[PDB]
Every structure is written in C-alpha cells, then in structure tokens.
Enzyme design. Structure first.
Site, PDB file in Angstrom:
ATOM      1  N   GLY A 210      26.463  18.148 -48.247  1.00 52.27           N
ATOM      2  CA  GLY A 210      26.958  17.097 -47.380  1.00 52.27           C
ATOM      3  C   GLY A 210      25.867  16.393 -46.598  1.00 52.27           C
ATOM      4  N   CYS A 323      29.080  24.549 -36.674  1.00 53.57           N
ATOM      5  CA  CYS A 323      30.465  24.158 -36.431  1.00 53.57           C
ATOM      6  C   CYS A 323      31.189  25.234 -35.623  1.00 53.57           C
ATOM      7  CB  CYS A 323      31.190  23.873 -37.761  1.00 53.57           C
ATOM      8  SG  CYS A 323      31.214  25.233 -38.976  1.00 53.57           S
TER       9      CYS A 323
HETATM   10  N1  SFG Z   1      20.319  33.720 -46.103  1.00 52.99           N
HETATM   11  C1  SFG Z   1      20.846  32.455 -46.551  1.00 52.99           C
HETATM   12  N2  SFG Z   1      19.871  31.761 -47.164  1.00 52.99           N
HETATM   13  C2  SFG Z   1      20.134  30.511 -47.680  1.00 52.99           C
HETATM   14  N3  SFG Z   1      21.381  29.978 -47.575  1.00 52.99           N
HETATM   15  C3  SFG Z   1      22.377  30.689 -46.951  1.00 52.99           C
HETATM   16  C4  SFG Z   1      22.122  31.911 -46.441  1.00 52.99           C
HETATM   17  N4  SFG Z   1      23.264  32.382 -45.887  1.00 52.99           N
HETATM   18  C5  SFG Z   1      24.228  31.440 -46.057  1.00 52.99           C
HETATM   19  N5  SFG Z   1      23.688  30.397 -46.713  1.00 52.99           N
HETATM   20  C6  SFG Z   1      24.335  29.167 -47.101  1.00 52.99           C
HETATM   21  O1  SFG Z   1      24.572  28.256 -45.790  1.00 52.99           O
HETATM   22  C7  SFG Z   1      25.510  27.384 -46.124  1.00 52.99           C
HETATM   23  C8  SFG Z   1      26.468  27.113 -44.949  1.00 52.99           C
HETATM   24  C9  SFG Z   1      27.217  25.790 -45.191  1.00 52.99           C
HETATM   25  N6  SFG Z   1      28.349  25.740 -44.408  1.00 52.99           N
HETATM   26  C10 SFG Z   1      26.323  24.590 -44.860  1.00 52.99           C
HETATM   27  C11 SFG Z   1      26.992  23.258 -45.377  1.00 52.99           C
HETATM   28  C12 SFG Z   1      25.946  22.129 -45.480  1.00 52.99           C
HETATM   29  N7  SFG Z   1      25.339  21.939 -44.217  1.00 52.99           N
HETATM   30  C13 SFG Z   1      26.543  20.813 -45.945  1.00 52.99           C
HETATM   31  O2  SFG Z   1      26.244  19.748 -45.354  1.00 52.99           O
HETATM   32  O3  SFG Z   1      27.324  20.755 -46.915  1.00 52.99           O
HETATM   33  C14 SFG Z   1      26.239  28.008 -47.302  1.00 52.99           C
HETATM   34  O4  SFG Z   1      26.089  27.215 -48.384  1.00 52.99           O
HETATM   35  C15 SFG Z   1      25.519  29.371 -47.552  1.00 52.99           C
HETATM   36  O5  SFG Z   1      25.471  29.667 -49.023  1.00 52.99           O
END
Ligand code: SFG
Length: 384
Positions: A210, A323
């Site tokens: 996103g 969020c």
């Molecule tokens: N240790 C980690 N290293 C890398 N990514 C991670 C980790 N833990 C969670 N995530 C990812 O952080 C993301 C959280 C999402 N909500 C972020 C959405 C993103 N900001 C967007 O604009 O669509 C997820 O995709 C997870 O797979």
C-alpha cells in the site's frame, strides 16, 4: 459497545485518554470508517478522470482538499438500532464473514457457521456473528441444507447490512490499476516521508505494498524502492499489486527486517510501518488483543526501529507508523528513538491530532478524524 473491549484494555484507554474520550473512541471503533478512502493511481490516471469512471458505475466519490490523490466515499448506516430484535430465523456467520457483511458484503456459503433449520430460499433472515452480534439482515438464496453444505455460492443476499461501504474490488477501474484502497492516515504517511528520486529508500515492512506503491507514484516510477517483508505469501500478493498498478519502481526482498543492517545499505529515507497490536483498526467487532500484547509488540517493534536507525545515513529520515492507539508502541517507542540519536521533525501535512504529551508526532482518532486509529512519527538522524 463497551463489551467489544476487554475490561483491562478499557481501563487502559480511560487512563490514557480520559473516560469521556476513551468512550467516544471505542464507540466509533466498533463502526466502519465514515469516510472510506482510496488512492488515485497517478501512474495510470488522474483524479478527475477516475472520478468520471467511478460515476459511470453509480458511485459517488468525493475529493480530498488535502490529498490531490485522495478520494473517499461516504459510509451508509447504521441501518438498524443497536438493540433491534428482528423476528427472524438466525444465520450464524463465522468471524470473518460477519465483519464483511457488517459493511455490506453478501454472505457466501463458506462464510456460514450454522443456521436455523427452517430456512428456505426466499426467507428473510437475520445474520449474527458467533457471539450473537447482529451484523445484517437479508434474504436466503439457499435452503438450510445447501447453506450448511455448499463449498461456494450465495447464501444470503444482504439487503440490510448494519453499515454499507462500496465494494471496489470487482470494478474494471480496480482491475485496470486505477486506484488502491487505502486509509487517509496511511496516505499522509507516504507524503510526510517526502520521497525523492535520488533518495535510497527502504520500506522494511512493505507487504501488501500500500504505502510502497504510493511512494512509487510520488516518485513517478523513477528511482528505486527497496521493499522488505518476512511473509512470502504477502510478498506474493504485493507482486500482484505492483503489476496491476503498473509499478516498475520497486525491488522486493524477503527477510527478517530486524536484521536490515546485514545489507550494506545506508538509506536516506526509511519507512517503518510497523507490525502492531492494531488497536485502531475499524470496524472493531470484538477486540482480542489486550495489555500483554501491547508490551510484547512494543518490545518487538524496538528491534525494527534499532535496525532502521543503524541503517540510516546521518541526516537521514525515518517515518514510523502504526494502526494502533497504545502509548507504548507509539510515543513510548519514539522516546526510545530520541535516546538513540534521532530528532523529531515537523511533518509536511498535519491534519490529525498532537501526540500524547508530545509535540511533532501525529495521531488520528476515529471520533475526531473519521479514520482508523493511527500514529505517525517523522525523525531525523542527527548522529550515530
Ligand atoms: N520481522 C519482520 N520482518 C519483515 N516483515 C515483517 C516482519 N514481521 C511482520 N512483517 C510484515 O509487516 C507487515 C505489516 C503490514 N500491516 C504492513 C502493511 C504495509 N504498510 C502496506 O502499506 O500495505 C506484514 O506484511 C508482515 O509480513
């Protein structure tokens, strides 16, 4: 509505916001956003052109006076009282189906948990979640038997959802990559980063892409964006989003972002949209996370933060966003950053609220801004 939130979390909110505001937040949290935002993909189309395209489909998009790439739809509802007791046979939807019905989705057979056995096609039925929450009323398009057995198909035509948001996934305009559904605070996040074609840029929790693709169109498909995620499936979905939006700007890397300095990269701009307790997301039918999750997750975010700070050039910029509403994951973790050589900077767009006892960070509240609960911090790395 208070029942949707565990008692200790409620005490926490009252403590952190004050009883009155806490109650206004939780009440609004139980409802879908009043203004449902999408991002105009300026890589493929202008705002006004897309508006014309959406009007063709009978939709009523409104323009944001703050985000030239912002359009939003006004939510409908509530369509019935919170105490309404319809004299109708009950269909029980599972937890996920119930939330989508709550916002206007039809109920499909796999979404059906169980039902009243007297239900025949054409019957008027009420839809409840597994905890008895009334989320919608409609007309059965299957008999009881088919409803509890089918693997696909329409089970209840929802003619009276509690709330109604437009369904945009099935539009030609969506398939052609003309827009990407995204909340207002999330869009503000990318703008406040102010990405430049020259900047070395890292989105270290990027999937489903996103904010990444938002940066891409601000860069106008120039430069390069490195987008990191641990999940391969979510990265798989991000690949699809990139192709659809016509984004040619992004390099995907799968890895634990807490080990970011393992690369040899010193970024100029880092976006950290950190995994969080998500206390601010809407609609909030039932909150499952509580205080133990806040502390654990807050501690977990620090690893990302520290990784980012070490990967930033001096004079570099970090934008941290969640969020969630908690202090610990937000203002508390920014104090952490301030102790590690980071400096708070004025954000280019400020339409939300000030932070808790803290001046240049930006919060969004559902009762004040008609958005999900959100937090945005922009920092400058003054030294190592
Ligand atoms: N240790 C980690 N290293 C890398 N990514 C991670 C980790 N833990 C969670 N995530 C990812 O952080 C993301 C959280 C999402 N909500 C972020 C959405 C993103 N900001 C967007 O604009 O669509 C997820 O995709 C997870 O797979």
């Amino acid at each position: 509505y208070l029942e949707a939130f565990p008692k200790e979390l409620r005490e926490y909110y009252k403590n952190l916001f004050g009883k009155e505001e806490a109650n206004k937040i939780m009440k609004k949290l139980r409802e879908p956003v009043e203004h449902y935002y999408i991002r105009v993909n300026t890589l493929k189309i202008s705002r006004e052109k897309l508006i014309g395209e959406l009007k063709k489909e009978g939709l009523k998009p409104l323009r944001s006076p703050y985000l030239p790439e912002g359009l939003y739809f006004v939510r409908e509802g509530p369509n019935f009282s919170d105490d309404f007791e319809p004299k109708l046979p009950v269909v029980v939807a599972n937890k996920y189906a119930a939330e989508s019905v709550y916002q206007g989705a039809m109920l499909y057979a796999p979404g059906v948990l169980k039902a009243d056995k007297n239900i025949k096609e054409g019957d008027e039925v009420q839809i409840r979640d597994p905890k008895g929450l009334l989320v919608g009323i409609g007309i059965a398009r299957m008999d009881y038997k088919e409803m509890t057995e089918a693997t696909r198909g329409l089970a209840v035509e929802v003619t009276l959802p509690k709330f109604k948001l437009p369904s945009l996934s099935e539009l030609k305009a969506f398939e052609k990559g003309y827009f990407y559904p995204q909340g207002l605070p999330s869009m503000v996040t990318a703008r406040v980063l102010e990405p430049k074609e020259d900047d070395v840029i890292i989105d270290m929790a990027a999937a489903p892409g996103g904010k990444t693709t938002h940066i891409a169109q601000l860069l106008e498909n120039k430069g390069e964006i490195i987008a990191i995620d641990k999940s391969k499936n979510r990265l798989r979905k991000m690949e699809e989003n990139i192709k659809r939006l016509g984004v040619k700007n992004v390099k995907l890397v799968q890895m634990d972002a807490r080990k970011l300095p393992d690369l040899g990269i010193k970024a100029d701009k880092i976006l950290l949209d950190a995994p969080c307790t998500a206390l601010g997301v809407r609609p909030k039918l039932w909150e499952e996370r509580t205080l133990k999750h806040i502390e654990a997750t807050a501690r977990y975010q620090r690893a990302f933060i520290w990784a980012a700070i070490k990967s930033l050039r001096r004079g570099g910029v970090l934008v941290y966003s969640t969020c969630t509403l908690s202090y610990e994951e937000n203002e508390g973790n920014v104090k952490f950053m301030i102790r590690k050589g980071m400096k708070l900077e004025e954000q280019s767009i400020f339409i939300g609220s000030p932070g808790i006892g803290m001046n240049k960070v930006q919060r969004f509240y559902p009762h004040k801004h008609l958005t999900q609960g959100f937090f945005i911090a922009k920092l400058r790395k003054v030294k190592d």
